[PDB]
Amino acid sequence: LTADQMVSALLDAEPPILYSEASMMGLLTNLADRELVHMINWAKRVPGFVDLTLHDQVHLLECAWLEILMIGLVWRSMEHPGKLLFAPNLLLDRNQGMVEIFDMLLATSSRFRMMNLQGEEFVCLKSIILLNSGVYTLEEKDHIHRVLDKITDTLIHLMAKAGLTLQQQHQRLAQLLLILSHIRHMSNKGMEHLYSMKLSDLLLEMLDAH
């Protein structure tokens, strides 16, 4: 596949923006739960995902589902500084919270804005999370890394086409990937927070994997 077809394929597979309706938890469960149904269909449309086994697809989504949810919330909240756009009708401030995990989402949102992250780079970073979050947990592993190398080739291509020099392409690719380490830390603390809230049948299944 191309570097251009990779972006358009990810751009076309983007999920929609859903709407919302002790009290705060209620809106977030229904939002996450309904938001994963589209994430399952989006995952199937990521190049190379359907090539994996049914068990591999399950495991990859079991450990990356909350990471993808958070990077998506950060993306649509990137242009609402100091706020988080859970939904078009659910734009919440830093005082409407939990807050520990709230501040981390805002810092990431303010960081993407600092780097002026583009949509073409967002869909790539989101696909990397889906394929990398569970790769370290034999012939199938080489294929996942083969796709990951292709997405990396796509990120660089987007940076090179943007006028960046080689030193700046490597620096931007490093800055983007280093944020995934913080996005994973946010999901780790978010899994402990939702496990300390004891929802939805599909959710609870995701809660028992961690």
């Binding site: 149904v37 199937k44 049914l54 697809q57 989504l61 079991e62 299944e205 995701m206």
Partner: peptide
């Protein structure tokens, strides 16, 4: 369990 039916 459930997750399998969604990808199925």
């Amino acid at each position: 369990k459930i997750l399998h039916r969604l990808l199925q």
